[PDB]
Design an enzyme around this catalytic site. Structure first.
Site, PDB file in Angstrom:
ATOM      1  N   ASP A  99       0.834  -1.175   0.000  1.00 43.49           N
ATOM      2  CA  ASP A  99       0.000   0.000   0.000  1.00 43.49           C
ATOM      3  C   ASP A  99       0.870   1.226   0.000  1.00 43.49           C
ATOM      4  O   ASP A  99       0.359   2.338   0.045  1.00 43.49           O
ATOM      5  N   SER A 151       2.600   6.556  -1.562  1.00 44.89           N
ATOM      6  CA  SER A 151       1.873   5.976  -0.479  1.00 44.89           C
ATOM      7  C   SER A 151       0.592   5.886  -1.216  1.00 44.89           C
ATOM      8  O   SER A 151       0.001   6.903  -1.561  1.00 44.89           O
ATOM      9  N   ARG A 152       0.214   4.641  -1.578  1.00 46.24           N
ATOM     10  CA  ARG A 152      -0.769   4.320  -2.584  1.00 46.24           C
ATOM     11  C   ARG A 152      -2.106   4.892  -2.238  1.00 46.24           C
ATOM     12  O   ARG A 152      -2.784   5.468  -3.087  1.00 46.24           O
ATOM     13  N   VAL A 153      -2.478   4.803  -0.941  1.00 45.61           N
ATOM     14  CA  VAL A 153      -3.730   5.329  -0.473  1.00 45.61           C
ATOM     15  C   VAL A 153      -3.507   6.774  -0.097  1.00 45.61           C
ATOM     16  O   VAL A 153      -4.420   7.590  -0.173  1.00 45.61           O
TER      17      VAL A 153
END
Lengths: 85, 236, 120, 48, 337, 265
Positions: free
Chosen positions: A9, A34-36
């Site tokens: 993530d 930071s994927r989210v």
């Protein structure tokens, strides 16, 4: 690595060349994600680093021109000067 | 989806996420089945498995289903057989690009890297088509000229070229639609803009009617009414 | 002959008679003329190649018969549109402004140009 | 004052018409500057 | 050519023009087309069928279908099966055109088969006898002897180039096997030039042997002009030699002339006058935007002024000095309007 | 990787090849205007030279040099610098007027006990009378140049549209006129202070020409450099392409081995 990238993530790519360039730690901030994203970032820190990304993104483009090493657009040199800092 | 389409008779909107994960999964159990995985470790039955899924999703006379299927393109290499194989089977492709995301534009799609099957001139309507040909050129002009603007310099280019660039920068940031679901990713509310309204508002920009409106007064705002309102807002 | 030149163009660089406004008054040159240097002043100049005469407004220069009887005239830029009233209006305002406002040389020029213009 | 500066000022003054050639308009409009120097050391640059 | 550039659209255009010839009595002029839709989803082929029905082409067309769902044995045997259908026509001495679209998906099916029989997969994990497979199919496309009743099975295989790599193993093999290639250019497609043909990377070995004499005369010049235009393409970056600048103008007008909106074929008797005009530089003068207006108008102008000439040109199939003379004049008259 | 790192560096080289190509074409366009100005200017200059020659052209010292703000003018900036460097061994304490930034940097290196005046905004603009006049006006007052025996100006004589030769010429003082005696084969009394006017006039008349000659050479050099760059980039393109092709084969082989091993087991 491909498998893990999918699982995770965030990805926090480091760059060795930049390690030598003297960012130590050297985070390859273009590929650092930071994927989210953000929701666990200090509120103050959200405000301040808002255009840090924009400046850097502009800096990346500007840097390409800058390494052609020609006379630069004045706007690009605002970026360049800030970008270096 | 089939039960809905068929048995309930209704139309649906299927959504699947992420079908590269479907590829990876299929690759793994192919190997485990002893069916030696083909190219780039992807199962030899990939094509036919894709075919079964994809053919199953269609507009029947029982119903109509609009799938929106997410795909992860490993290391943004779409020459890789697995994304490429899927690339054929899908009706209406879109490619989301990091650069445009970084520019802050939401959505992050690179529109010169988006192709939908419906784009035929009369099919989308001649006006829509003509406008869309013009938009594509305008943005493409900015990209082609970007190298010239970059090294040779912005101002050495033609006045006509510069106006096209200025329009493109306005249009570029008129692509920026703040999103309702990015009231948590940006805080700024969505914009639901009708199809006709979009055709009209983009047409206007191309005509250069709102070249007296800043590039940033298109940035992160909706339609023409909003664009004007943010021009006024910035003015104030 | 005459060589009447400009940096970006040339005006005549076998001009029969030239009537020139000079720091020697006015000078006329026809063929072999006495071997002179006279500064060409900001001028309205008539140049005749044959009997046909053409009238020029010039932002001055230098005039020189060479001792080989070559009339090297060098000037650095300027017609008849230039004479056309619009210049007079602008110049009247500008002359006045310069009057109130090196300043000596400038003001001398506003008046001089007003004369130079009238010469056209 | 320089004789050619006198002539120059005259050319500029004559444009106070402007109905003439493009090369003239460029030849009379310059945004150029100049940088004073001394012995290295720089007295401030000022527009030409 | 590159994936989903409407590769099928380029192909389909040929099929549509075959309607004109099909209407024509001679059975060499009756090319009974066979489209072999390989791995193509049934919805896509349904659209294809529907379009064909719209253009009333289903009555010389045959569609052999091995759709996306259709099994890899069916896909494997699908071009072979198709070829046999073609043989009846060919054997009957007639001519026909079989378009194998795309052998790239045929390849994948063979890969699946080979792997399932655990035969080692050849270069680029595409089975080793893929060369053999394709070759066996591709030499069935043949124009038989006159003792074998002068007939043929013309073929036009479609190969999908994943990244545009003709260097890719299946493209390289196929290129070797075949006698000509047409390589559509993605950039041109993107720049809306449809046809998107990359003129340099298109060759036909038979070429001008199978060219209408009229069209040969008035487009030998076109090849040379375009050659110069390619060099003078880079001259579009300006102060240029007058010759170069002329070339650039002539060339740009030509490029627009060779645009042909997708799904609208043209008659040969109307191809030849337009290219003649361009050759005579008549079109060079006409403004680029007005080329389009000029074209349709010119065709109607020609149709009104002298469809006697057009029919004569069509039926003679050659362009005589008298016809080319009249054409230069006719073009001048049209150019005036 | 090898494959990717080759490709990215190769892409850089490709993009550079393209930019230098593009610049080279644009340079040819610019060159035409530069040369055109220079013809008319040179014709004018020769007429002035007729006066000095026929008069007898018998004349620290001043050095003026010209090379644009703009770079990528090839080696004009440093070739002119080299011919200057020789004459900064002939006078290490010469009073320098530097016309444009590029020559300024090089000369500043050669002796920084010289630099008094320099002119910015030069390179961008093609030679113009307004500039020449203004430079002249400041020059007399500030540099007292005529006082120093001999003035010399450096420029680049545009030998061919593929070459540039750094060149210098001497600008003539009021002194040149004064004690040259075939000045008497021109006639003026004292009704004009012809040295005090003509010196000022020829300061510009020569300088504008020198700049025109220079500008044509400058643009010619820019074209030359940018052409040779396209070639150099091409050579490197070819070298990394062959490496790319080999690397591609190796990847195929390494993958193939994995498959073979798998089938074997």
């Amino acid at each position: 690595p491909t498998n893990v990238i999918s699982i995770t993530d965030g990805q926090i790519f480091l760059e060795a060349e930049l390690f030598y360039k003297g960012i130590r730690p050297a985070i390859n901030v273009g590929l650092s994600v930071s994927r989210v994203g953000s929701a666990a970032q200090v509120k103050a820190l959200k405000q301040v680093a808002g255009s840090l990304k924009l400046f850097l993104a502009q800096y990346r483009e500007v840097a390409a021109f800058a390494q052609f090493g020609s006379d630069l657009d004045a706007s690009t040199k605002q970026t360049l000067v800030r970008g270096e800092r | 989806a089939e039960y809905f389409r068929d048995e309930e008779g209704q139309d649906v909107l299927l959504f699947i996420d992420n079908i590269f994960r479907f590829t990876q999964a299929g690759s793994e159990v192919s190997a485990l089945l002893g069916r030696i995985p083909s190219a780039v470790g992807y199962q030899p039955t990939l094509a036919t498995d894709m075919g079964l899924l994809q053919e199953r999703i269609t507009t029947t006379k029982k119903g109509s289903v609009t799938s929106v299927q997410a795909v992860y393109v490993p290391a943004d290499d779409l020459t890789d057989p697995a994304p490429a194989t899927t690339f054929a089977h899908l009706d209406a492709t879109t490619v989301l690009s990091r650069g445009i995301s970084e520019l802050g534009i939401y959505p992050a799609v690179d529109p010169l890297d988006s192709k939908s099957r419906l784009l035929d001139a009369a099919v989308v309507g001649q006006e829509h088509y003509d406008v869309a040909s013009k938009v594509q050129e305008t943005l493409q002009t900015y990209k082609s000229l970007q190298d010239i603007i970059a090294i040779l310099g912005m101002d050495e280019l033609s006045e006509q070229d510069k106006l096209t660039v200025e329009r493109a920068r306005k249009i570029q940031r008129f692509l920026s639609q703040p999103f309702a679901v990015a009231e948590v990713f940006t805080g700024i509310p969505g914009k639901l803009v009708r199809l006709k309204d979009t055709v009209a508002s983009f047409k206007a920009v191309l005509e250069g009617k709102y070249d007296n409106i800043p590039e940033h007064a298109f940035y992160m705002v909706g339609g023409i009414e909003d664009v004007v309102a943010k021009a006024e807002k910035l003015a104030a | 002959k005459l060589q009447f030149a400009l940096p970006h163009e040339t005006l005549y660089s076998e001009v029969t008679q030239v009537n020139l406004p000079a720091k020697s008054g006015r000078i006329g040159v026809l063929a072999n003329h006495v071997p002179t240097v006279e500064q060409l002043l900001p001028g309205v100049v008539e140049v005749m190649e044959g009997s046909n005469s053409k009238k020029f407004f010039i932002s001055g220069g230098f005039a020189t018969v060479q001792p080989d009887s070559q009339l090297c005239v060098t000037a650095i830029e300027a017609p008849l549109e230039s004479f056309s009233e619009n210049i007079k209006n602008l110049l009247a305002e500008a002359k006045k402004n310069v009057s109130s406002s090196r300043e000596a040389a400038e003001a001398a020029i506003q008046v001089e140009v007003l004369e130079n213009l009238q010469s056209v | 004052i320089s004789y050619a500066a006198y002539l120059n000022v005259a050319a500029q003054a004559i444009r106070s018409t402007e109905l003439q050639t493009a090369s003239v308009l460029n030849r009379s409009q310059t945004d150029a500057f100049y940088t004073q120097y001394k012995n290295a050391s720089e007295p401030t640059p000022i527009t030409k | 050519g590159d994936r989903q550039t409407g590769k099928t659209a380029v192909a389909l255009d040929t099929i549509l023009n075959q309607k004109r010839w099909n209407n024509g009595s001679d059975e060499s002029k009756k090319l009974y087309c066979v489209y072999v839709a390989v791995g193509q989803k049934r919805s896509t082929v349904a659209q294809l069928v529907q379009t064909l029905e719209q253009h009333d082409a289903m009555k010389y067309s045959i569609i052999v279908a091995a759709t996306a769902s259709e099994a890899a044995p069916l896909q494997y045997l699908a071009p072979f099966t198709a070829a046999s259908i073609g043989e009846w026509f060919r054997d009957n001495g007639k001519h026909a055109l079989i378009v194998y679209d795309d052998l790239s998906k045929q390849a994948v099916a063979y890969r699946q088969l080979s792997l399932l029989l655990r035969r080692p997969p050849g270069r680029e994990a595409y089975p080793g006898d893929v060369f053999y497979l394709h070759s066996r199919l591709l030499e069935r496309a043949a124009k038989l002897s006159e003792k074998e009743g002068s007939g043929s099975l013309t073929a036009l295989p479609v190969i999908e180039t994943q990244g545009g790599d003709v260097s890719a193993y299946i493209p390289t093999n196929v290129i070797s096997i075949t006698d000509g290639q047409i390589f559509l250019e993605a950039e041109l497609f993107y720049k809306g030039i449809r046809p998107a043909i990359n003129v340099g990377l298109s060759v036909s070995r038979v070429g001008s042997a199978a060219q209408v004499k009229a069209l040969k005369q008035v487009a030998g010049s076109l090849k040379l002009f375009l050659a110069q235009y390619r060099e003078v393409a880079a001259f579009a970056q300006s102060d240029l030699d007058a010759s170069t600048k002329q070339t650039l103008v002539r060339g740009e007008r030509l490029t627009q002339l060779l645009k042909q909106n997708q799904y609208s074929p043209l008659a040969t008797e109307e191809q030849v006058p337009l290219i003649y005009a361009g050759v005579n530089g008549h079109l060079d003068g006409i403004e680029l935007s007005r080329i389009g207006e000029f074209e349709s108008s010119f065709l109607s102008y020609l149709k009104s002024n002298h469809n006697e000439l057009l029919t004569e040109i069509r039926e003679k199939g050659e362009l005589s000095k008298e016809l080319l003379a009249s054409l230069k004049s006719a073009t001048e008259s049209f150019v005036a309007t | 990787a090898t494959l990717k790192e080759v490709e990215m560096r190769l892409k850089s080289i490709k993009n550079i090849e393209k930019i230098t190509k593009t610049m080279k074409i644009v340079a040819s366009t610019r060159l035409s205007k530069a040369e055109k100005a220079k013809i008319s200017a040179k014709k004018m200059d020769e007429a002035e030279q007729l006066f000095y020659k026929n008069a007898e052209t018998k004349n620290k010292e001043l050095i003026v040099a010209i090379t644009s703000d703009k770079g990528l003018c090839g080696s004009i900036h440093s070739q002119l610098a080299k011919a200057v460097r020789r004459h900064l061994n002939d006078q290490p304490n010469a009073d320098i007027v530097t016309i444009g930034d590029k020559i300024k940097m090089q000369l500043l290196r050669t002796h920084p006990n010289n630099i008094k005046l320099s002119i910015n905004g030069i390179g961008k603009d093609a030679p113009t009378f307004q500039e020449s006049a203004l430079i002249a006006d400041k020059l007399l007052s500030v540099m007292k140049a005529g006082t120093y025996p001999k003035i010399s100006i450096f420029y680049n004589d545009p030998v061919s549209s593929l070459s540039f030769e750094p060149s210098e010429k001497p600008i003539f003082n009021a002194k040149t006129i004064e004690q040259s005696p075939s000045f008497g084969k021109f006639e003026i009394d004292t009704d004009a202070n012809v040295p005090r006017d003509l010196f000022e006039y020829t300061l510009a008349n020569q300088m504008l020409t020198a700049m025109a000659q220079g500008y044509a050479a400058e643009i010619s050099a820019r074209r030359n450099a940018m052409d040779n760059a396209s070639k150099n980039a091409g050579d490197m393109i070819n070298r990394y392409s062959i490496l790319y092709n080999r690397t591609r084969q190796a990847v195929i082989t390494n993958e193939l081995v994995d498959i073979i091993t798998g089938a074997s087991s």
